Amino acid sequence: NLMLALLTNFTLATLLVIIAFWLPQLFSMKFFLVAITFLLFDLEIALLLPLPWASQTANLNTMLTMALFLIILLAVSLAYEWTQKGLE
Amino acid sequence: MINILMLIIPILLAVAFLTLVERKVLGYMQLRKGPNVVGPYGLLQPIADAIKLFIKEPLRPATSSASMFILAPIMALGLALTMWIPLPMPYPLINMNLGVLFMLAMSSLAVYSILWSGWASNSKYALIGALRAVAQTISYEVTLAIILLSVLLMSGSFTLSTLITTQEQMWLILPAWPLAMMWFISTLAETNRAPFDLGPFALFFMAEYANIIMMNIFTAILFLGTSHNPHMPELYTINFTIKSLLLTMSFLWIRASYPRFRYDQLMHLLWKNFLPLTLALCMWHVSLPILTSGIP
Amino acid sequence: NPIIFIIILLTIMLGTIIVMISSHWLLVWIGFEMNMLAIIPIMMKNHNPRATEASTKYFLTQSTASMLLMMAVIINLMFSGQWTVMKLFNPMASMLMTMALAMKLGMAPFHFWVPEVTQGIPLSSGLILLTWQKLAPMSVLYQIFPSINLNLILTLSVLSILIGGWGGLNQTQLRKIMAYSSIAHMGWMTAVLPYNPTMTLLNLIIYIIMTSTMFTMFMANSTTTTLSLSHTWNKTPIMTVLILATLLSMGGLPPLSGFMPKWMIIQEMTKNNSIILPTFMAITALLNLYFYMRLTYSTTLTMFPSTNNMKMKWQFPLMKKMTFLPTMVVLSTMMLPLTPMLSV
Amino acid sequence: AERVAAFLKNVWAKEPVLVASFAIAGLAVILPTLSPYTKYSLMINXXXXXXXXXXXXXXXXXXXXXXXXXXXXXXXXXXX
Amino acid sequence: SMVYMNIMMAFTVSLVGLLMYRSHLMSSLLCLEGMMLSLFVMAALTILNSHFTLASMMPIILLVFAACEAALGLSLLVMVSNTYGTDYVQNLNLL
Amino acid sequence: QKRLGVDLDRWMTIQSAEQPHKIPSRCHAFEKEWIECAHGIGSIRAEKECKIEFEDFRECLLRQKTMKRLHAIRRQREKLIKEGKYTPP
Amino acid sequence: MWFEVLPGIAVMGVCLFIPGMATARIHRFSNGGKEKRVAHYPYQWYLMERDRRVSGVNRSYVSK
Amino acid sequence: ELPSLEDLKVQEVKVSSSVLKAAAHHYGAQCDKPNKEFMLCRWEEKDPRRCLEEGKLVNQCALEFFRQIKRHCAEPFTEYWTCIDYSGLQLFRRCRKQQAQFDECVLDKX
Amino acid sequence: MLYIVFILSVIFVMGFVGFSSKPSPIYGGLGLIVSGGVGCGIVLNFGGSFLGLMVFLIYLGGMMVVFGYTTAMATEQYPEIWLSNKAVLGAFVTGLLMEFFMVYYVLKDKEVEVVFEFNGLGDWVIYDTGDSGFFSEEAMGIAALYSYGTWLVIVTGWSLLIGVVVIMEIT
Amino acid sequence: LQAEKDRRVLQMLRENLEEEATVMKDXXXXXXXXXXXXXXXXXXXXXXXXXXXXXXXXXXXXXXXXXXX
Whether the Cβ atoms of residue C85 and residue E53 lie closer than 8 Å to each other: no
DSSP per-residue codes, C140-207: HHTTS-SSS-GGGTSHHHHHHHHHHHHTTTT--BHHHHHHHHHHHHHHHHHHHTTS-STTHHHHHHHH
Asked if residue A88 is part of any domain, the answer here is: no
Q: How far is H70 from chain B (nearest CA, A)?
A: 27
Amino acid at H58: V
Q: Please identify, in words, the CATH class of the domain defined by E2-84.
A: mainly alpha
Q: How far is CA C164 from CA B25, B71, C135, C261, D14, in A?
A: 80, 54, 19, 18, 64
Amino acid at E63: L
Torsion of CA A81, A82, A85, A87, to 10 degrees: 140
Whether the Cβ atoms of residue J7 and residue I90 lie closer than 8 Å to each other: no
Chains that touch B (3 or more CB pairs under 8 A): A, D, G, H, I, J
Structural domains of chain I ordered from first start: 3-168 (1.20.120.1200)
Amino acid at B24: K
> Chain J within 8 Å of F85 (Cβ-Cβ)?
yes
Q: Please report, in angstroms and rounded to a whole number, the separation of the first and last CA atoms in chain B.
A: 32
Chains that touch F (3 or more CB pairs under 8 A): A, C, D, E, I, J
Torsion of CA A51, A57, A59, A62, to 10 degrees: -40
What is the spatial distance between Cα C224 and Cα C176, in angstroms, rounded to a whole number? 9
What is the spatial distance between Cα B15 and Cα B10, in angstroms, rounded to a whole number? 9
Neighbours of C192 (CB within 10 A): 22
What is the spatial distance between Cα I142 and Cα B149, in angstroms, rounded to a whole number? 17
What is the DSSP secondary structure assignment for residue I58, as one 8-state letter?
I
Spell out which residues of chain G touch residue B161, defining contact as CB-CB under 8 Å.
Answer: 38
Cβ-proximal residues to F78 (8 Å cutoff; 6+ apart), any chain: none
Q: How far is CA I147 from CA A60, B17, C113, I153, in A?
A: 9, 52, 42, 10
Chain F residues bordering chain D (beta-carbon distance below 8 Å) = 21-23
What is the spatial distance between Cα B109 and Cα B99, in angstroms, rounded to a whole number? 16
Amino acid at A14: T
What is the DSSP secondary structure assignment for residue H3, as one 8-state letter?
P
What is the spatial distance between Cα J69 and Cα G48, in angstroms, rounded to a whole number? 8
Which secondary structure element, helix H or strand E, spans residue G15, and what is its range? helix G12-15
Closest by Cα among A28, F69, D23 to J52: F69
Whether the Cβ atoms of residue J5 and residue H49 lie closer than 8 Å to each other: no
DSSP per-residue codes, B201-228: HHHHHHHHHHHHHHHHHHHHHHT--S--
> Chain J within 8 Å of F52 (Cβ-Cβ)?
yes
The distance from CA H28 to its chain's CA centroid, rounded to whole angstroms, is: 8
HEC profile of chain D: CCCCCHHHHHHHHCCCCHHHHHHHHHHHHHHHHHCCCHHHHHHHHHHCCCCCCCCCCCCCCCCCCCCCCCCCCCCCCCCC
Spell out which residues of chain B touch residue I65, defining contact as CB-CB under 8 Å.
Answer: 108, 111-112, 115, 138
Spell out which residues of chain E touch residue F59, defining contact as CB-CB under 8 Å.
Answer: none
B123: left (phi > 0), else alpha (psi -120 to 50), else beta? Answer: beta
What is the spatial distance between Cα B73 and Cα B204, in angstroms, rounded to a whole number? 6
Amino acid at G31: N
Question: Domains in chain A: how many in total?
Answer: 1
Q: Give the 3-state secondary structure of residue A32.
A: helix
What is the spatial distance between Cα B23 and Cα B35, in angstroms, rounded to a whole number? 8
What is the spatial distance between Cα I21 and Cα I10, in angstroms, rounded to a whole number? 18
Q: How far is F27 from chain E (nearest CA, A)?
A: 7
Half-sphere exposure of D4 (CA within 13 A, CB side): 1
What is the spatial distance between Cα I124 and Cα I145, in angstroms, rounded to a whole number? 32
Q: Any contact of H with A, at least 3 CB pairs below 8 A?
A: no
We report the CATH number of the domain holding residue A41 as 1.20.58.1610
Q: Give the 3-state secondary structure of residue B39.
A: coil
Q: How far is A42 from chain B (nearest CA, A)?
A: 6
Q: How far is CA J6 from CA C118, H48, I137, in A?
A: 69, 9, 21
What is the DSSP secondary structure assignment for residue C314, as one 8-state letter?
P
Cβ-proximal residues to H75 (8 Å cutoff; 6+ apart), any chain: H105
> Chain B within 8 Å of A44 (Cβ-Cβ)?
no
**Inter-chain contact F70–I136, Cβ cutoff 8 Å?**
no
Q: Where are the alpha helices (DSSP H) in I88-144?
A: 88-103
What is the spatial distance between Cα E16 and Cα E25, in angstroms, rounded to a whole number? 15
Beta bridge partners of C224: C173
Provide the total of helices (H) and of strands (E) in chain G, helices listed first: 4, 0
Crossing angle between the packed helical segments B233-257 and B200-222, to the nearest 10 degrees:
120
Beta bridge partners of C173: C224
Closest by Cα among F20, D57, J68, B109 to A63: F20
Q: How far is CA I33 from CA B120, I28, I54, in A?
A: 18, 10, 14
What's the CA angle centered on H8, arms H3 and H12, to 5 degrees? 150
Cα-only R_g, chain G: 19
What is the spatial distance between Cα B198 and Cα B218, in angstroms, rounded to a whole number? 25
Closest by Cα among C2, E45, J22 to I9: E45
Torsion of CA G25, H96, H92, H83, to 10 degrees: -40
What is the spatial distance between Cα C341 and Cα D1, in angstroms, rounded to a whole number? 64
Amino acid at C338: L
Cβ-proximal residues to C137 (8 Å cutoff; 6+ apart), any chain: C19, C32, C101, C104, C105
The distance from CA C167 to its chain's CA centroid, rounded to whole angstroms, is: 15
DSSP per-residue codes, E24-77: -SHHHHHHHHHHHHHHHHHHHHHHHHS--SSGGGHHHHHHHHHHHHHHHTHHHH
Whether the Cβ atoms of residue B272 and residue G44 lie closer than 8 Å to each other: no
Chain E residues bordering chain A (beta-carbon distance below 8 Å) = 63-64, 67-68, 71, 75, 78, 82
* CA max distance for chain H: 53
Whether the Cβ atoms of residue I140 and residue E44 lie closer than 8 Å to each other: yes
Length of chain E: 95
**Inter-chain contact F20–I149, Cβ cutoff 8 Å?**
no
Whether the Cβ atoms of residue J5 and residue H41 lie closer than 8 Å to each other: no
**Inter-chain contact A71–B279, Cβ cutoff 8 Å?**
yes
Closest by Cα among C154, F65, B105 to I59: B105
Q: How far is CA H23 from CA G33, H90, J1, in A?
A: 16, 11, 17
Cβ-proximal residues to B9 (8 Å cutoff; 6+ apart), any chain: none
Asked if residue A1 is part of any domain, the answer here is: no
Q: How far is A2 from chain D (nearest CA, A)?
A: 29
What is the spatial distance between Cα B177 and Cα B167, in angstroms, rounded to a whole number? 15
The pair phi, psi for residue C173, each rounded to 5°, is -70, 120
Mutation pick from C18, C21, C134, C200 vs chain F, by most beta carbons of F within 10 Å, is: C21
> Chain E within 8 Å of I4 (Cβ-Cβ)?
no
Q: Any contact of C with D, at least 3 CB pairs below 8 A?
A: no
I75: left (phi > 0), else alpha (psi -120 to 50), else beta? Answer: left
Amino acid at A51: L
Buried residues in C214-239 as b, exposed as e (16+ CB within 10 A): bbbbbbeebbebebbbbbbeebeeeb
Mutation pick from G43, G45, G48, G50 vs chain I, by most beta carbons of I within 10 Å, is: G43
Half-sphere exposure of E87 (CA within 13 A, CB side): 27
Amino acid at B290: I
Whether the Cβ atoms of residue J15 and residue J53 lie closer than 8 Å to each other: no
Q: Give the 3-state secondary structure of residue C224.
A: strand
Closest by Cα among I168, I64, I57 to E29: I64
Asked if residue A78 is part of any domain, the answer here is: yes
Whether the Cβ atoms of residue G24 and residue B90 lie closer than 8 Å to each other: yes
Q: How far is CA H100 from CA E22, F6, H80, H95, in A?
A: 77, 60, 10, 9
Crossing angle between the packed helical segments H33-44 and H52-71, to the nearest 10 degrees:
160
User: Least CB-CB distance to A9: which of B78, B135, B267?
Assistant: B78
Closest by Cα among B118, E26, B120 to I25: E26
**Inter-chain contact I63–A39, Cβ cutoff 8 Å?**
yes
Taking 3-state DSSP, the helix, strand and coil percentages for chain G, each rounded to the nearest 5, stand at 60, 0, 40
Spell out which residues of chain I touch residue D50, defining contact as CB-CB under 8 Å.
Answer: 135-136
Neighbours of A78 (CB within 10 A): 18
In chain G, where are the structural domains located? Answer: 1-64
Whether the Cβ atoms of residue I37 and residue I93 lie closer than 8 Å to each other: no
Whether the Cβ atoms of residue D32 and residue B290 lie closer than 8 Å to each other: yes
Q: Give the 3-state secondary structure of residue I27.
A: helix
Cα-only R_g, chain E: 17
Domain containing A29: what range? 6-83
Closest by Cα among E79, B20, C116, C125 to I170: E79
DSSP per-residue codes, H13-70: ---SSSSHHHH--TTTTSS-HHHHHHHHHHHHS--TTTTHHHHHHHHHHHHHHHHHHH
What is the spatial distance between Cα C163 and Cα B194, in angstroms, rounded to a whole number? 66
Length of chain C: 344
Whether the Cβ atoms of residue C133 and residue C11 lie closer than 8 Å to each other: no
Buried residues in D35-74 as b, exposed as e (16+ CB within 10 A): eeebeebeeebeeeeeeeeebeeeeeeeeeeebeeeeeee
What is the spatial distance between Cα C35 and Cα C13, in angstroms, rounded to a whole number? 9
Closest by Cα among B285, D18, B291, D26 to A67: B285
Mutation pick from I115, I164, I166, I171 vs chain C, by most beta carbons of C within 10 Å, is: I166
The distance from CA B133 to its chain's CA centroid, rounded to whole angstroms, is: 16
Closest residue in I to D51 (Cα–Cα)? I135
Closest residue in J to I130 (Cα–Cα)? J47
Whether the Cβ atoms of residue J27 and residue H26 lie closer than 8 Å to each other: no
Amino acid at J33: X
Length of chain G: 64
Amino acid at H51: C
Q: How far is CA H64 from CA H56, H61, H75, H105, in A?
A: 13, 5, 19, 19
**Inter-chain contact C119–E95, Cβ cutoff 8 Å?**
yes
Q: How far is CA J16 from CA J6, J38, J39, in A?
A: 16, 20, 17
**Inter-chain contact A77–I164, Cβ cutoff 8 Å?**
yes
Provide the total of helices (H) and of strands (E) in chain B, helices listed first: 14, 0
Amino acid at E52: F
What is the DSSP secondary structure assignment for residue F40, as one 8-state letter?
S
What is the spatial distance between Cα H105 and Cα H72, in angstroms, rounded to a whole number? 9
